Write an enzyme that holds these catalytic residues in place. Structure first.
Site, PDB file in Angstrom:
ATOM      1  N   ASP A   1      -1.002 -13.041   1.449  1.00  0.00           N
ATOM      2  CA  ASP A   1      -1.422 -11.904   2.268  1.00  0.00           C
ATOM      3  C   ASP A   1      -1.697 -12.567   3.658  1.00  0.00           C
ATOM      4  O   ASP A   1      -2.774 -13.158   3.778  1.00  0.00           O
ATOM      5  CB  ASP A   1      -2.675 -11.277   1.646  1.00  0.00           C
TER       6      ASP A   1
ATOM      7  N   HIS B   1       0.904  -1.179   0.000  1.00  0.00           N
ATOM      8  CA  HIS B   1       0.000   0.000   0.000  1.00  0.00           C
ATOM      9  C   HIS B   1       0.954   1.244   0.000  1.00  0.00           C
ATOM     10  O   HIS B   1       2.074   1.286   0.593  1.00  0.00           O
ATOM     11  CB  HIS B   1      -0.768   0.146   1.393  1.00  0.00           C
TER      12      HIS B   1
ATOM     13  N   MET C   1       2.182  -5.680  -8.128  1.00  0.00           N
ATOM     14  CA  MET C   1       0.822  -5.240  -7.683  1.00  0.00           C
ATOM     15  C   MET C   1       1.102  -4.155  -6.643  1.00  0.00           C
ATOM     16  O   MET C   1       2.103  -4.190  -5.857  1.00  0.00           O
ATOM     17  CB  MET C   1       0.060  -6.398  -7.077  1.00  0.00           C
TER      18      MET C   1
ATOM     19  N   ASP D   1      -5.576 -14.783   8.819  1.00  0.00           N
ATOM     20  CA  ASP D   1      -4.369 -14.614   7.941  1.00  0.00           C
ATOM     21  C   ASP D   1      -3.183 -15.559   8.383  1.00  0.00           C
ATOM     22  O   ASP D   1      -2.073 -15.048   8.470  1.00  0.00           O
ATOM     23  CB  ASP D   1      -3.904 -13.134   8.070  1.00  0.00           C
TER      24      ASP D   1
ATOM     25  N   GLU E   1      -9.349 -13.690  -1.788  1.00  0.00           N
ATOM     26  CA  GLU E   1      -8.429 -14.138  -0.737  1.00  0.00           C
ATOM     27  C   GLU E   1      -8.999 -15.379  -0.083  1.00  0.00           C
ATOM     28  O   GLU E   1     -10.171 -15.425   0.258  1.00  0.00           O
ATOM     29  CB  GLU E   1      -8.306 -12.989   0.347  1.00  0.00           C
TER      30      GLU E   1
ATOM     31  N   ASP F   1     -10.701 -12.599  10.844  1.00  0.00           N
ATOM     32  CA  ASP F   1      -9.745 -12.927   9.700  1.00  0.00           C
ATOM     33  C   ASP F   1      -8.368 -13.260  10.306  1.00  0.00           C
ATOM     34  O   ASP F   1      -7.740 -12.374  10.891  1.00  0.00           O
ATOM     35  CB  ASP F   1      -9.801 -11.663   8.882  1.00  0.00           C
TER      36      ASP F   1
ATOM     37  N   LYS G   1     -14.464  -9.015   0.767  1.00  0.00           N
ATOM     38  CA  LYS G   1     -14.303  -9.510   2.162  1.00  0.00           C
ATOM     39  C   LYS G   1     -15.702  -9.321   2.764  1.00  0.00           C
ATOM     40  O   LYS G   1     -16.295  -8.267   2.500  1.00  0.00           O
ATOM     41  CB  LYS G   1     -13.242  -8.695   2.933  1.00  0.00           C
TER      42      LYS G   1
ATOM     43  N   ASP H   1       2.455   1.938   3.283  1.00  0.00           N
ATOM     44  CA  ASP H   1       3.485   1.038   3.791  1.00  0.00           C
ATOM     45  C   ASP H   1       4.885   1.591   3.366  1.00  0.00           C
ATOM     46  O   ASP H   1       5.884   1.320   4.079  1.00  0.00           O
ATOM     47  CB  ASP H   1       3.367  -0.363   3.130  1.00  0.00           C
TER      48      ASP H   1
ATOM     49  N   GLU I   1     -10.990  -6.691  -4.364  1.00  0.00           N
ATOM     50  CA  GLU I   1     -10.813  -7.815  -3.382  1.00  0.00           C
ATOM     51  C   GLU I   1     -12.014  -7.767  -2.401  1.00  0.00           C
ATOM     52  O   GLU I   1     -12.142  -6.781  -1.619  1.00  0.00           O
ATOM     53  CB  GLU I   1      -9.526  -7.493  -2.636  1.00  0.00           C
TER      54      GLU I   1
ATOM     55  N   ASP J   1      -4.932 -13.856  -3.537  1.00  0.00           N
ATOM     56  CA  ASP J   1      -4.266 -13.735  -2.230  1.00  0.00           C
ATOM     57  C   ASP J   1      -4.383 -15.086  -1.442  1.00  0.00           C
ATOM     58  O   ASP J   1      -5.500 -15.572  -1.234  1.00  0.00           O
ATOM     59  CB  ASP J   1      -4.908 -12.649  -1.343  1.00  0.00           C
TER      60      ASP J   1
ATOM     61  N   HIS K   1     -10.891 -14.835   3.201  1.00  0.00           N
ATOM     62  CA  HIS K   1     -12.135 -14.032   3.102  1.00  0.00           C
ATOM     63  C   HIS K   1     -13.350 -14.814   2.698  1.00  0.00           C
ATOM     64  O   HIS K   1     -14.452 -14.705   3.292  1.00  0.00           O
ATOM     65  CB  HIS K   1     -11.911 -12.811   2.162  1.00  0.00           C
TER      66      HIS K   1
END
Ligand SMILES: O=C[C@H](O)[C@@H](O)[C@H](O)CO
Ligand SMILES: O=C[C@H](O)[C@@H](O)[C@H](O)CO
Ligand SMILES: O=C[C@H](O)[C@@H](O)[C@H](O)CO
Ligand SMILES: O=C[C@H](O)[C@@H](O)[C@H](O)CO
Ligand SMILES: [Mn+2]
Ligand SMILES: [Mn+2]
Ligand SMILES: [Mn+2]
Ligand SMILES: [Mn+2]
Ligand SMILES: [Mn+2]
Ligand SMILES: [Mn+2]
Ligand SMILES: [Mn+2]
Ligand SMILES: [Mn+2]
Lengths: 385, 385, 385, 385
Positions: free
Chosen positions: C285, C52, C86, C255, C215, C253, C181, C55, C179, C243, C218
């Site tokens: 991810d 992002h 990406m 992950d 994802e 979530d 969710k 980030d 994406e 993802d 998700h």
């Protein structure tokens, strides 16, 4: 990975016998004679079978037909060496049980449920069962006013206390195992999880007669970790029996063969059973999908046992691997097993290293190394060491 | 629907004080001084507040700063007449608790967790709390090898036994309430439901010191019926405290204000609390959504209490309605409250009307009339009589 | 099972960079410099990283600091040969996005969200990204009156149409991937599943510019079958990116690293990706659990890639096994691939064998042989052929 | 709250006709003649009924018996003024459909499914239906190898394209509505949600002939927000029909009467239907619980309609309340309805107030006032203004 009778694999009559009726469809398979299922299961390597009353003797059978169905069944067990370690009662199929057996609001139905149960306890003892299961699948409600739950637990306590009086009066060597399920076929079922069943047992008059028979798919219908609930039942000394199957998450009760569903939870369940030395039956309560013919029924029953023996081999290789034993110490599993304060309360209160001079930043910075341990567990499950 | 202090409504400091940090976002509100929250809640009609240690005294505060934070807090309670019926410990925020407090694999952390707890028990007693809550939100695991659950329940038993030795040695009048939660922030949390917590208490050295503090949203995170779990905690005599909030089904713990989420479960919960005569605090453990400013915080806290008083009025109108009392008899709720076999075992076995001459078809044909009862409950909830 | 850059494994900066802040706890790890994560990932065999905006460049950075953060990053990519396939925008962390970015009720915020997005599209193109992801984690609501969803989809359409005008006007070769969710951090998120995202794309002005980035965790947060949703995105020609991670059922979530969670769904996902010839990045991810130190971070990132290569080997062995190819014909997978009525409508209507003389009992009696096929798939996954 | 035929309330024959067979129990009620259900529903105020083929004409009926069952049915509709706005096909009960109808792996079954469907389309048109529903409850799989989903969507597309060729060739005025369901009776069902069904329709040859028939309980079986999925179907112009019922969360499909289950989602659904001006049938697809006799069946059918009219009154009072209209502006619902950038792309890029001089802190500090709005919605639902 060939099962023998010493692996203690058992199957309900109603499992390979399920005709495939579902809420939306007709039967896809003809009914099996119990004698034929005994023979086929013995050929696959099972150790024994289990039954509800009404699986063995058709509901409403006269005393004469009853004795005949039992005689033929007993012949097949003699012919094959199959045992019957567990039996249970059907208090869910007949319309009379539409609001429950032991907690039906109609008192007459509740008395009928107990009489039907006691008749089957005598049969079970005659056939050598050591465990009698109770699954109250109709005990519960779809709406909040239909069931006062305090009164319903009084009724449930009363029924289990009367059964424990009966077995002790007869001098039978049989213990009870309550099987929890959170919903289906009722909107919510009473004692919906292993914890609720453990807690309820502690209020019975003779708690030592009662344990749990948890089922993989049932706890996963509440999104719970099945191996953690079995560790708690083992910690309480109450794992009397277990039902093995597979379930893909929170939805209707699928009863897939064991190993299907959540395969890592299957691995950690076998790891725990074999490391705690559970010695009861490994019983499969599953349904071959209705897509299957008879060939597919026996293939699905055989994959139950296959998957258990593969997971047993993989979990024993995991715990035997020196590199895993090293990683377990790196993650402080050895320290979890030591008492926190065998020194006692006063000593803990006087210990400055436990508070006043405890370096919280240094302890916070230590990694647990859990992900390396879990990848070793993954590599061992997949045979990728 | 105006609350007064006699309704016994309480709030955690951390609830109206939540700054709105979530796993994906920064705080949206400034921190509140505990003194300001005491004043604002007293103006809305609450009866009292509750606290974790670290909500009241910032972690790492010196003895001098500690005494100052307590003195100011005590001034606000004196100024407003607010009480502190419950307190608890933060064993979840600091990085040292990343693998648990009482069941951390590191023994040093486990000793630290007990010392931090006991220091706060003394404070709680000083401020008059009668209940001390334990929520072990970090006790659990993300992977199967990281936590041997039998050893972890030994550790959890050991910690609770030491706390019960401490309070009895001090002669304090304080009881413990364990608060279950099935997941979040750990992948699975130990004692995940009210049933698991009830069962665990029966293995402690002095079980009478410990009960449950169930939370609405926590049991609904496992898809369970909250009113049924509270009826079981009431049946066991262990509902020491309760946490009220709302949750929309099985997902992250939302902590919406009470009445949001599942509104019919809210109705049947108030119905049960008021009909069983629960007399503890009605405590709200909720988070005003992070969309809100301070005005929206106090509006959300006020709607907690509002919704409880509306549901109380509706459930009392339901049980008082002669037509509902008639429908309850039509559905045989009166018969559920009578013993199944006060006549005893032998009498039941000799009674031909319970089996040999029981007409199962006639009993099967009687309707339960549950849907008419449930629509009366709906009409009463909606004010549509 | 050693990854190289030709396996096209990618990682977000925010994944190995997650400091371990959760709704209930402080960070357990220090922040990583993006340059260090580029170097460490290149040493483990990854092909590239994603980001992002916030980030890479700290929110509020001046133009001068911006250019400096980019220059250092570009040096590390030059040093290692890592790519950036990406990029995406943070429209979820800052308090301004508390009610959404593109569907915030405040129009000023919606305009700000688009400007922040376009600035990052230019950066992404400069660094060579081919896909720009949009995850609208704040688009949604906790309560029913706060968001009119029709107006919100008009706003969401408007934002995506403006972005597609911008890229076409600039002549950029970049496509968008939405994406989905279903919840978290909002109570419900708009476009909650792959199907909702596919359907929405068909109403944009230039649908060919937009696909999905589904994802694993998700879709499993809604209890859905991830491989089935990816097969539908592949069938529509819209799998632009994916993802990869793990999730244990319906809850927050998690992950977890890829292969954790539902391991059979992981197997059938790799089977599908490699058999359909997906050629995009295999992007992870995931969050190394907060129990871990830096060593445990790189171990968890390495197990993502390891598990993908083991599953790839197992799924290729499954489809190559002659006995599996035989079982696939026994279950009529070959017949599923043939047109039902290439003969056309009239011919089907005149065909007596399709109705008037179709023997439904004989067709009903054929077993599908699915359980034998699924046990071959299990044996191949476990290396137990 | 008395329904009349102008409220457009409809019921399936199979709903009041459900005999109460469940996966664990026998029927508790005798079968109803369709003629009797037409009469009883007309007396309660319904507008019409719907049917699967096999509800009206018993499977395997000769042409002569077929004409007789239709003649009697048509007499009852003439006698009562009841309409038949929707019809559908049973492709799920008979064993031949054990692996699906349109996506069965056996091509012969797929051709049979289409012929059975077309025969019922002609009947439906004859009886005046405007919508023909397709619920593919057997389209899906319990295991990953049994169904290649890309080939299965080719088959599903092919079947729907052939049906659209047939209706256009006949010149019928009938449109199709696909009804999604995520699981049960298959382990996973294809097109499991409204979004998946909307996306699939956009790949059919003549998309304008097809819409959705979403069901309350089905989307809630995936934990999704039903009103949000209906707003998306309305936004796409595809809400052709709707099925109303209640469901308590993620578990088996309960089909409780409408208003049971999630009552706030019921309120926001009626709010949306009546504010968007949906003018199709309000159809109930529910099952009176098997605890009920015939009296309880008609009480449950009547509470479906009652609850809809109470919620309609409450949602209209909510939107008409000046204080609610003020709160909607306070929460910027008016601003959500205005275009973000009607000024166009270039203008947005040149606007310094959208980025360079946008005060993000001031915009972040504004509260959304959502909790006050949601408590007004609660007060209006409960009649507690
Ligand atoms: O009563 C049935 C059993 O004992 C139960 O195990 C079913 O097979 C449900 O799971
Ligand atoms: O420790 C916190 C509490 O006692 C707990 O109630 C939280 O507020 C979690 O629910
Ligand atoms: O925006 C973030 C991403 O693109 C999203 O993938 C998060 O990492 C959520 O999943
Ligand atoms: O085919 C049946 C229907 O059209 C479906 O609506 C059922 O009643 C399932 O929901
Ligand atoms: Mn089961
Ligand atoms: Mn079972
Ligand atoms: Mn909570
Ligand atoms: Mn709480
Ligand atoms: Mn995620
Ligand atoms: Mn993601
Ligand atoms: Mn349904
Ligand atoms: Mn339906």
């Amino acid at each position: 990975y060939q099962p023998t009778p010493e692996d203690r694999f058992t199957f309900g009559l109603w499992t390979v016998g399920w005709q495939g009726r579902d809420p939306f469809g007709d039967a896809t398979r003809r009914a099996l004679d119990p004698v034929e299922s005994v023979q086929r299961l013995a050929e696959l390597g099972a150790h024994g079978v289990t039954f509800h009353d009404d699986d063995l003797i058709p509901f409403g059978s006269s005393d004469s037909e009853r004795e005949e169905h039992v005689k033929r069944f007993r012949q097949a067990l003699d012919d094959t060496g199959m045992k019957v370690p567990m039996a249970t009662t059907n208090l869910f199929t007949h319309p009379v049980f539409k609001d429950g057996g032991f907690t039906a609001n109609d008192r007459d139905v509740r008395r009928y449920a107990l009489r039907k149960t006691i008749r089957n306890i005598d049969l079970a003892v005659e056939l050598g069962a050591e465990t009698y299961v109770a699954w109250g699948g109709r005990e519960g409600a779809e709406s909040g006013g239909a069931k006062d739950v305090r009164d319903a637990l009084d009724r449930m306590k009363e029924a289990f206390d009367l059964l424990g009086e009966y077995v002790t009066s007869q001098g039978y060597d049989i213990r009870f195992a309550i099987e929890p399920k959170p919903n289906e076929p009722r909107g919510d079922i009473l004692l919906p999880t292993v914890g609720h069943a453990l807690a309820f047992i502690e209020r019975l008059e003779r708690p030592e007669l009662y344990g749990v028979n948890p089922e993989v798919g049932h706890e996963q219908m509440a999104g719970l970790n099945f191996p953690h609930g079995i560790a708690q039942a083992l910690w309480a000394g109450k794992l009397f029996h277990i039902d093995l199957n597979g379930q893909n998450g929170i939805k209707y009760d699928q009863d897939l063969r064991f190993g299907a569903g959540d395969l890592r939870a299957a691995f950690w369940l076998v790891d725990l059973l074999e490391s705690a030395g559970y010695s009861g039956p490994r019983h499969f309560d599953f349904k071959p999908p209705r897509t299957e013919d008879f060939d597919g029924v026996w293939a699905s029953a055989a994959g139950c046992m296959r998957n258990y023996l593969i997971l047993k081999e993989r979990a024993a290789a995991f715990r035997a691997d020196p590199e895993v034993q090293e990683a377990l110490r790196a993650s402080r599993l050895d320290e979890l097993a030591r008492p926190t304060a065998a020194d006692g309360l006063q000593a803990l209160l006087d210990d400055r290293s436990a508070f006043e001079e405890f370096d919280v930043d240094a302890a916070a910075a230590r990694g647990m190394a859990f992900e390396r341990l879990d990848q070793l567990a993954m590599d061992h499950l997949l045979g990728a060491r």
